[model samples]
Target: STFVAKDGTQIYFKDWGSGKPVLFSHGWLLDADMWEYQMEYLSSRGYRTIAFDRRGFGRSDQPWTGNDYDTFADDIAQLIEHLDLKEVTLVGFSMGGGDVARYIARHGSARVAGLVLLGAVTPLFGQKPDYPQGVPLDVFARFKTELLKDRAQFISDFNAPFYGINKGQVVSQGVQTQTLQIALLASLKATVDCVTAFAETDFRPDMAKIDVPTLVIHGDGDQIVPFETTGKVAAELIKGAELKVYKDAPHGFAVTHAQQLNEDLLAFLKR
Candidate 1:
């Protein structure tokens, strides 16, 4: 995805059963498949479900330079237009959160009806002098440093805190392995540069541009994207946005707390 966009952000997207549309944007390194639980459940409930592998991940064509936020935002618009989707509700997780927020700011919400931010990186993510609440710059810097040092190891080891195994959260080896594999499908450069894209980009202004009904869901125990600076801050920014906190849940609570997440989403989608 290019900041100065072109066709370089070409993506492979899936369209599920039909009804009110729900478009999913995947998280950092994770591909469209990461939304399996939400997609299957929502589709079964008579909602159209769609998700695209962000450029540089899964089947999407990756251009070296366009991995920035502006390019990422453009890709969502492209997919929405091609599908001729209307009254679409965007569900963005982690890095995808930035995409959703930026999309509304850059493209306007004429076709979009509602929004959902799940463990999103919004308002602000990584630290800058003005954004003291953000995750430290050094922390994001380490992500790039570690990934470059050992791509496989970094992806594998990340599973621990990502699902909060380090905090006594439970995740099956099968689930862990699948999540790892999805992340591994991403290009190395995308893996590294996205640390910069998601971390450094400021989305506060973009969030202010949100004019649709919005839901912000996050786990208080999240070890990936911090709750306070992201979902919490987002709920405050978007007028009338609802915030739901999963107690003792991790960043991937949509997986860990699948039933709860699904029910909550259905309730919101029903609105």
Candidate 2:
């Protein structure tokens, strides 16, 4: 189904099965389909699963505006309230990680019962005086410039590192093709804007404020968002947060290591 955002954007979503609600927000340039493995498995296991395409990705209406974290989080808030879902478990991967963080910071977690972050880019991502572990601004600048220069090739080259293929990991050609397909659906404007949104927005305070049961999971070998900078720091910041580290897993472990991720997620929810 679908719902209209505060800005009148039609956000697309998938609601399946029934039980405690689990809402998933996908990473940059990816739609709700990125959560299909989790959604399908979790829903069949008796939890209600909800996954939505961000404003500019997937089947959602692609609008040039409202691409920042505030709007992204607000869009999630709207979905929660509209669906009247309570005791929700909010799951975010990669950039979706920032979406959930800002959501808790701005809207509070009164409606949320749990939070799960997979290879999330959180706390802070870009290099600043205070955050020396983050990627340099010039790096993101170069990325944005390249994205505009050759969108297709940029995504192609990016997908390799995103999945750690460039680091010599082996992912099936089918999976790689599918990943590229999902990313290609995004609008150029949305793709470019998200570079700044995910890289620059600091969620350190947001992580500290979250009071719900939280699980921070990451692949130790993630090249996109380093373990030290994002997941490890997030686990430390969120009180009582539990973390599970995947040895040598890459950023796109959602596909590469789906079996392990799904198992961990199931165990966390059941606990």
Candidate 3:
């Protein structure tokens, strides 16, 4: 379906099946299709699955500008308004999670039903006096420089840290490999842009604004977003939100452990 962003960018979205609305916002470097596992499972189980390709990713328009958390949140907020949805569940992964928190903070939760934060970066991703253990600025700087310098090489290397796929951890290589390939589909520009945004942007104050029932899910072994720094803190700040940690799972749990993720999501949706 077609929805217009505040900037008049025609955002492409898919509304599958019929039931309560469940909006899926994907992580950095992934389009709506990346949530195919949850989309199909939830749609078939009698829930309206709403997913969209943000302006610069997937089949959506690839504009040269307008790709920050504010704009991203604006697109999502306007889309919900355009769709005239009520009792909506916003499911955000990684970068999408940052957008979700900021959106709810900026717009309030009257229209939002709940939130599912999957490996989301929020409540501050940087190391400060109180929030220690956050990734140093230097690490993110290296990613930004690499992405800006060599597009092809950056995409391949980006997956190693994201999935913890290096270090000879022998999980099923095929699925992880496919996710790595999908990472290449996103623009080097967008990759560089979003990664920099995540590192520099802080959504600490927004946490208290999210008053809806929130669920935080993260793989204990997730590398892209360290658990001690992100997931655990998000759960505490969301005001009674539940936290679920998947042991022996990596950052690509959506692909590596889709079934379990789907099952957990189903239960969360019901509750």
Candidate 4:
């Protein structure tokens, strides 16, 4: 299904099964399809799983601008309202976690039942003099530069570190290729601008406003979006948030540690 945003962008969404609602917000470059494993698992267990392509990626309309958090989160609200989903649990992975945070901050949690932050880059990802836990701003800038230089090659190569291939983790070739395929579907302009949004947008104050049940998961072995800098700190900032660490898992733990991830997700929602 598709929902048109305030700016008239068509945001694509896929809904499966029937039960309590679960909405997935994917990371940078990737799309709704990235949540396959988790969606597959939960849908059959009395949960209706929903995932969507962010405005600039996948089947969604690729508008050059409005790639920032406000629009991203609004797209999510638009999806929920479009579907008329109630008691929804929004699952945000990596940069998508930032979307979930901003969604609640911007729209509040009247329809939101809960939220899970999986390997998310929240609160802050890039460094500020006051925020010493984040990575340098130059790091995200370099990502934009490399992506602009060789879009396909950069996207393909990025999956290695993301799936823990560099840390000797074994991800099937097809899985890696699938990730690359999905990454390429995003517009080059939005893909580049997403870096700036993820890097610069600060959700530090938004943490305190969280009133719903929150689950924060991260891999201790993550090569991207350090657990200490992001997950650990975000958990601390969100009052009553539960932080679950995956042993030796990477940033792509939702796929790499799918079994464990699903177990935790089910356990969280069952509560």
Better of 2 and 3 by TM-score: 2
Q: Residue by residue across 168-216, what tens digits does model 4's lDDT show?
A: 8989999998898998888999999889998999988778878999999
Q: What's the lDDT for candidate 2? A: 0.91
lDDT of candidate model 3 versus the reference:
0.82
- Give one digit per residue, the lDDT tens place, for model 3 in 109-194: 99899999998887677666665678888888887877777866766666666666674344455655666666666666667778
- Distance from true location, Cα of 146 in model 3, Å: 0.6
Model 1 Cα RMSD, Å? 2.3
- TM-score per candidate: 0.96, 0.98, 0.93, 0.98
- Report model 2's TM-score to 2 decimal places: 0.98
Steric collisions counted per model: 2, 0, 0, 0
- lDDT, candidate 1, equals 0.88
Where does candidate 2 clash, by residue pair?
none
lDDT of 4 at 87: 92
Model 1 lDDT per residue over 68-183, tens place:
88988888888887788999999999889889889899999999999999999898888889788788889988888888889888988888998999999989999999988888
User: Which residue runs of candidate 1 sit more than 4 Å off their true CA positions?
Assistant: 1-5
- lDDT-superior candidate, 3 or 4: 4
Instruction: Provide the clash count, candidate 2.
Output: 0
